[model samples]
Target: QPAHLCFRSFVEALKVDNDLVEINTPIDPNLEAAAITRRVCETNDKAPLFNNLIGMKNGLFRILGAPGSLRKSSADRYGRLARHLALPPTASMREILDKMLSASDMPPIPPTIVPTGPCKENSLDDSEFDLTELPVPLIHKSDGGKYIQTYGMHIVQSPDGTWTNWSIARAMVHDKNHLTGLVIPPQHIWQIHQMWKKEGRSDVPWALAFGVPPAAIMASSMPIPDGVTEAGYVGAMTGSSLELVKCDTNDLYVPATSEIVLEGTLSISETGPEGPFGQMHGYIFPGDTHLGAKYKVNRITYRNNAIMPMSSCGRLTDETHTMIGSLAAAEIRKLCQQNDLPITDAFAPFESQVTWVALRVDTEKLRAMKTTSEGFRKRVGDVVFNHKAGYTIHRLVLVGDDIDVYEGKDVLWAFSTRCRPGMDETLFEDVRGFPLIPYMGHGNGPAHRGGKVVSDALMPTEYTTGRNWEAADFNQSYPEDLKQKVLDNWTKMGFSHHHH
Candidate 1:
């Protein structure tokens, strides 16, 4: 089986590479479980797998934290994220994006239906299970309450079954049998739920799968095109079909190897308070609540020794900021290429909190266009701000081929050096922006909403005479033989190459 096809094996692969740590010490789900995850995330340390919990007994289940956290290794800075896409652990950022982009053009491999799978080993109906029985975590110290569904996949389909949407959104535990979650306006869940509502139905069938296939989770985090199902795209990316089993209380199908699945329905008529919880931007206020739709859980099922994957969304370096930024940039990259733009690769620096997307420009191809810099910038703005992933994207930085967008410092240096403050930046009109961003919602920095901006960091004369100056970097200034000699004798000098 592919490593990304199952959560257990993904952990196994990560363990083999020394990217994981299993905690035998019992941790509290209240705040402690999430605290360690946050600590590990910011440190870019090994993923923490909690085998023991303060509230659970008899190995009932487990929790895996920071599944998408980065690894600070010279061998592979993006090893953890690469493994999720079944790429070589040492794969570079551009290589990972290439894999993600290639899958979009390949024929989708839809999942295969299986008789009964691992998650079905044990089942709990309405009275047999309680949400409170599970070790639901209060992610942040200031969170309004426990959020049981941070990293889980919410499976919802159109009334006619033509469209099946699987995505991740937060949820707050309301009671033993109900959950209040963000059925946000822009997400597919709210759109699908509206179809049910318009059909005179009071509720829509829902199933939230946790500890699903690693590739499946990554796909869930992706903003794939509207009508496309992530399941097929996941299969295409893995080059193998996912085995899916029917849910006990719903028509939706979940990965057969999932560690846990909650079968339920989301009510449209009644709504409940959603949050005062800390958000992905790493901040939480005292009084914040949304009348989110309530989920009436009907059943629960899981495999033995189940591991619940938790995304402690906070600060930079966490999965919430990393996954979407990478995935969205991949989508935007593909769209830009299809539109015949000169972008070779794109990256969203985690330090920017997913706000700045760096597009590496092929100066050769750019020169061929022979267009004015402003005109080309306008074309890029039209291509990016008009795309679906554009909604969350706040700014785009166009860097020259010499700049490595994947390297945060390289991008910063390029922007500082090449981009003229007012002359090179183009501002697009204010549209639908993600309000979760601090300034967008709290300050209305742009009328309670905001638009996007594109900053051209490419040299102004590149399209004409090309760059006339060489950078003061070693490789850029030194000869090939001299550089090789230095690299070949690096250990002799008691110095070493470092990724960070």
Candidate 2:
């Protein structure tokens, strides 16, 4: 059966599956809720649904953390991601990526307009809106301020209204009516802001929706190409049109079933000190100037018993890596294939945050082309490092098809065994990179453009010629008959036998 599309329905599914932990004990919105969430992510336990917040009313607002954390059980480590992506709980990581990539070919299904939705059940306009009164958590003690827009989707349209962009950017509560966050250039939201700037507009109309449909939130995390509406791709992913409601103050539309929506405009000229918050890369910028675009909240709309999803972005395996990394892998794979690269799989291991991207090489195609190790490495680097999606990527590891790109152990094994210190690695110079990447600031180079390393994790023979690989592990070292006989009588031999 397909998974639930709405956030509430998905939470119900989690409860039924015993994957959600309902905590009735009062939790402080400041750091306490986020502490519990961080522990959940670290332990890979059930998602914590806090029913009682320290200061906020129970039914008025609730906070859900680790909604996208991985599972602890070995049988379904990816169960949480599977559920969100509408796959079976026991789905393999490979299957999950395959499902995400397949959606690329599916034509976009535009959203349907609804006159009203649960989000509009309670609406506050003008002075009635107060962000500070909500249960917005100060996720980390070191964070500059309370953040209410961590996992929400920011909806904005181009000046001509040809493209509607939906993305996830952290927002810090500046006051009762205003919030501030980043809107950097070269990104979709910033690009649209530039368009509005060209037209001499003071502010860009925008809307932020939280606890939206699962599929809708998933689309918000993706690096969907420019000019492509995330709502349309979301519709295609869920196999139906996403229901949307027009905002009260602007032409922008938000998810009809969102738990909460903030209708506002982002000021073009007004900038404020925004961050020191723990970002996806698991680090907080300690010093120097901190500034971001200030967004004013004009209206607030929400449903009763609303739940706000929060991503405590401090370490690996959080939504920053799981959601954003998966999206980047799928998109990078799609980009590679579009250019005729024989790439079997692409994945960003959670341990790398958003830096390292691993690609499985199709040895058959390499042999057919008769490309050597150095030649293939250079070619792959050129294709990946020069692309727009590669801006955030710092390291690219090339492996053979046998290794699963999603598994950290497999990737590490390949890197340790096949790659040499200097011979099998190549670095691309003058490559563009995201300035926030820690290594970029440390290295002496052109600002925003740094060197990228592409390591050949595949054995030379694997790419140059025939299959000359053999496993030395216990499972592969034994003869077929010996292994089969031992496996068939494993229980009888006084040992537990479990198939992985």
Candidate 3:
């Protein structure tokens, strides 16, 4: 769908981005590059190309750690997000979010069942392939094992063979025949498995796609409504019907331009102890709770010279935060609009991992709809919290229309002004969650299956009729000429350019 469709190699994109950092030293696969990349991505730094992987077996494997998070400026901050939708390089975060919302509404354009493509260049059956030999990075020092598919998109078909889901979840290489990982409950894969169980089947056919079209990978990370094919939304995002090729053996489809594809099946009857690993929540397993659930991997396949894109897991800024959770929040905004709610924008700032969410509202619209703050807040929580994306979120912040959900300070300001810790906040009990999330399935606090929320983060209804005190800020009331002069002559004014 990308016109003139010149697929740039991972190394090529890095080179075009300017001076790339390549570590020739024996950087530990655990945290060395992952830490540097995470900090750089969050701070909007340059791309780091690791030519010398610590555990790399010769040149058999190479990792393009995080291609989507190299730059974090306002102009280019959403580059990865936009690129994920096949948009122009200069696309804004707002544009990206709007496009994602629009595309999710479009019907899916399934892949054409074709003979084959580059994915078959070096096909490996169960015998020749041993995942342990690939240079899959052991991202976090505390991780239980090396993860091979953190950013890869896993393709799974429905029991009735009517729907296919493209998902991105962490998977560690368990053995030659399998890659064990958790498919969070309530997601497309989990639901499909549920369907299989509703019948008598236990295993679901699957394919994991790596180094796919940047847009395809982003779509994979998105939390679209269940039963909607991601491939079709990806086509919508690209503004063209996606060209998909059928898997070598499975009945599902894969991105036609995918750099690597791992053909396999997920056994519904199988699951093992999976993790006690570091998570996006910025904490390692707290105690001797060195125990957690394990997922089972059934089969594996890949293309020749497959370069696996991975993230060293520890805190936010990993792919889980940068790709998965952020898109999930955008999808939340779409979900709200579909439900005819007053929601405008939503986001899960990396500062909170994915647990904390902020939702901006059109207060005027709320009044027009005759919706009370309490009623609307509960509905908002119920819609998202009960959904797939909601499973990963724990804290929800509801703010007035004036707040910029993307701005952390604005969100915090609302929290300070309108939220009363005990009274304004609400919680859900016994809700399902992604156990891989550090706080869930463990902790000193009382366990809750459902999530909680902080509502009406605006001057309470009592203060709406009165004039509020004005706050001083640069963007509030600065004169156009003075602002322009300050910006234009910043260097002469002895101000160095600073970025956030």
Candidate 4:
């Protein structure tokens, strides 16, 4: 197995760098545990490993909060996410993105089945366990119920066994053995569920796995193509095959080293109220317990002291930003490249809260194409908005190569300074949007499809005469020798800095 793929190894490595905080403090799982998690995720603090739950006596489990979230330090801001790809703690954001995007170049390595692993330390039949007895945290006060599977991955298969989709979908604990979650038509899991339904099966065999292989968890959150299995993609991303073990209750496979795995069936005919949990778009639709698919937990297998990681999805710098948001941006970049678009790089600014994506235009190639601002905007939107992964990106900002897409501040500067309000913006009338966008799913009237837009932040002159003017910023305005002289004289001039 790869070094970074296993959850245990990933936690140990973070400890070596002092990026982890293991607390034996008696924490209440009701709201206290999640409150601490939300705090750490928003503050970019260390990942919390809760060793002592208020009521648990048998060491039932532990919760690892913000496992792959951002760091607050200036030098290691991308450290946690970097380690997910096996990169050094000090790796640059560009290097991290490059490592993630490089999976596109390699073929996927499908997972291999093993008879057993650490998760098999304990197995509980449906009659032997009660979900209510476990220390599942109620993540948000406004949330309808306890979201036991916010960061967990779900395993479901197509009827013919052609497609096995491992995906991340939030599930709220409905009762002792039942979970309710989103099952809309847009997602792959729902498609498989509907596939089974159409084949006269009312129940779909499923499993929810927590503390899975870190690479597998990342791959599960990605918006890969329809036919491709995430298991293969995980292997491709980490350059090795991920090991798996068969479920005791179903014909599905989960990471052999998973901390916890809940086996059961997702009911097609039977449904329950779900949601009103804080969404990834940084807002909560309070008290709206809409209908959702009900999942029955028939069995469970877990490692001793299984660590169930929580993804506090209410705001920025959580898994929503670090894993899913970052992964979405990478996929869109690859999608653009595959279509031969002039866009080169991409980033989802954590500040945007998952609503927008920044796309960097290769100005030289863009100029060679001789496309107008309107023409380019329409093409980009048509290509992206029509695709599967583009739904989450409500606003698209197109910037020149001179602007760094990775820097949210620079992207903001270009959008504010270069875009000529009405002239540079293109609205796609019927663009499909991810309904979780507060404006899209909830509003005064019913949600509309015209909420998405593409802004050509690049100056129009760049197409023909090319950059009619220069920037007045420090690096752009000053001569190289003068800037070098100021840097050399910093200490001598009595100006203090990290000069050395």
Per-model TM values vs. the true structure: 0.94, 0.95, 0.86, 0.96
- lDDT tens digits, residue span 138-243, model 1: 8998888798888889999999988888899889889999999888766888889989999975589899999888888888888778888889888898889999
Which ten contiguous residues of candidate 3 have the minimum total lDDT?
Answer: 286-295
Each prediction's number of clashing residue pairs = 0, 0, 13, 0
Q: Give the alpha-carbon lDDT of every model.
A: 0.84, 0.83, 0.66, 0.84
Model 3 stretches astray by more than 4 angstroms: 1-11, 19-43, 51-60, 70-72, 286-304, 445-448, 461-469, 474-500
Determine which window of 10 residues in candidate 1 has minimal summed lDDT: 443-452
Q: Write the per-residue lDDT of candidate 2 for residues 210-260, one digit (tens) a residue.
A: 988887777788777889898888788778888899999998998888899
After aligning candidate 4 to the native by TM-score, how far in Å is the CA of 43 from where it should be?
1.6
Q: List the candidate 2 regions with Cα displacement exceeding 4 Å.
A: 1-3, 57-60, 286-289, 442-447, 491-500
Give one digit per residue, the lDDT tens place, for model 4 in 1-500.
44477787788878887889999989998889888988998898998989898766464688888887888886888888777778887887678777767766788888899999998999888788888888888888888988888878999999899899999988988898999999774578988898989998558999999988877777788888887888887788787888899999789999999989999999978999898888777788677788999999999898887788888777777888777777788889889988888888889887788678899988888889988989989989898888877868888999987888888889889999998888889987686767777777785433646678899898877887677776897787899999899989999999871211
| Candidate 3 lDDT by residue in tens digits, 1-500 | 34212123544655564524666666666667667766665565666667667665523355666666636556566555454555655776667777777776666654455566655565656676677776677666666667776777888878777788887777776766677777656667778767776786466778887767776677777877778888777767666666667776666777666656777677767665565556677766623233222333333444454556666555546567766667788888877788887788888866677677788877777656665556666788788777776767778888876778887788888777788876776667655655555455575444446445646575555223422545576665687788888889989979772334
The lowest-lDDT stretch of 10 consecutive residues in candidate 4 is 443-452
C-alpha lDDT of residue 352 in model 1: 83
Model 4: lDDT equals 0.84
